[PDB]
């Protein structure tokens, strides 16, 4: 009983559903999903409710989808690509990253004790397609509240894209068993205060991710000492195999005043002028 948007409307019958990826996400095939392609498959994420769904889950569904339809599109974020919405449960239609999340994507690729492995270059151009996305996401005036490698998406064509822009308890972990307070700016965590400059902040932790190749942040630390190891000013160590220019970086990413961190649109040209510089070769 929801109202159809004709735009972004697919009929239940064009999306072969697979098995789950992770609400609620499965695997789908869309046919059609281009209008000017009625016989094109596209492999996408379809979410939907789970069995035991709430009216405020259904809500939060349809407020993800209408937040992606305003924000619009960009090569770096997870984009809305459909909706069915007519005659069964709501099934919101998103790009599909077969590469995992970055998190997942950096720890597959690290030198033997994998397939692939990345070189330098690879690793600031992981760190340029997140602070694009995010530059984009900001100028759209969405403020993220959790970027973090795990919320970053790796496509086949290894295309970074930020996820779950669209939707606490400090003691809650991830499914990987890490504390999300660990990317959160000090005033986020202790003033609840939010903006774009305490997304820069995440966006430091993020780098350090990177360059760690999949690292946990503050392993073994509990919340309590978090808080405190903030309230002193601490800062993670420089990742090995990361230059002096990408520390200094991610630390100014931390600057303990918000107004004084870089924004999105300077990491974004110093992270295009740092690809450009840097080593393929090892
Ligand atoms: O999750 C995967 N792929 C995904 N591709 N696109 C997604 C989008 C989401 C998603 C979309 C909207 C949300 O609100 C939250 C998550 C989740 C997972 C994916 C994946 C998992 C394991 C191995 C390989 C791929």
């Known amino acids: 009983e929801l109202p159809e948007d004709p735009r972004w409307e697919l009929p239940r019958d064009r999306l072969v559903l697979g098995?789950?990826?992770?609400?609620?996400?499965?695997?789908?095939?869309?046919?059609?999903?281009?209008?000017?392609?009625?016989?094109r498959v596209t492999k996408v994420?379809?979410?939907?409710?789970?069995?035991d769904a709430t009216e405020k889950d259904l809500s939060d569904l349809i407020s993800e989808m209408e937040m992606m339809k305003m924000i619009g599109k960009h090569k770096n974020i997870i984009n809305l690509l459909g909706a069915c919405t007519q005659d069964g449960p709501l099934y919101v239609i998103v790009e599909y990253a077969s590469k995992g999340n970055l998190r997942e994507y950096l720890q597959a690729r690290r030198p033997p004790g994998p397939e692939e492995?990345?070189?330098?270059?690879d690793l600031v151009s992981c760190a340029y397609q997140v602070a694009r996305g995010m530059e984009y996401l900001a100028s759209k005036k969405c403020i993220h509240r959790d970027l973090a490698a795990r919320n970053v998406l790796?496509?086949?064509?290894?295309?970074?894209?930020?996820?779950?822009?669209?939707?606490?308890?400090?003691?809650?972990?991830?499914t990987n068993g890490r504390l999300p307070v660990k990317?959160?700016?000090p005033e986020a965590?202790?003033?609840?205060?939010?903006?774009?400059?305490?997304?820069?902040?995440?966006?430091?932790?993020?780098?350090?991710?990177?360059?760690?190749?999949?690292?946990?942040?503050?392993p073994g630390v509990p919340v309590e000492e978090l808080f405190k190891?903030?309230?002193?000013?601490?800062?993670?160590?420089?990742?090995?195999?990361?230059?002096?220019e990408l520390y200094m970086m991610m630390?100014?990413?931390?600057?303990?005043?918000?107004?004084?961190?870089?924004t999105f649109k300077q990491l974004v040209e110093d992270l295009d002028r740092i690809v450009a510089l840097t080593s393929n070769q090892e």
């Open 189 to 218: 965590l202790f003033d609840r205060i939010y903006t774009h400059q305490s997304d820069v902040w995440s966006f430091g932790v993020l780098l350090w991710e990177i360059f760690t190749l999949g690292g946990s942040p503050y």
């Open 19 to 39: 098995k789950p990826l992770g609400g609620q996400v499965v695997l789908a095939e869309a046919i059609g999903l281009d209008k000017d392609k009625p016989n």
């Open 229 to 244: 190891l903030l309230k002193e000013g601490h800062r993670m160590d420089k990742p090995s195999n990361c230059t002096n």
């Open 251 to 262: 630390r100014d990413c931390w600057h303990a005043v918000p107004s004084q961190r870089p």
């Open 183 to 185: 990317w959160m700016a």
């Open 45 to 51: 994420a379809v979410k939907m409710l789970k069995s």
């Open 154 to 174: 790796v496509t086949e064509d290894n295309v970074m894209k930020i996820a779950d822009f669209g939707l606490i308890d400090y003691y809650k972990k991830t």
């Open 117 to 121: 492995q990345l070189s330098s270059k």
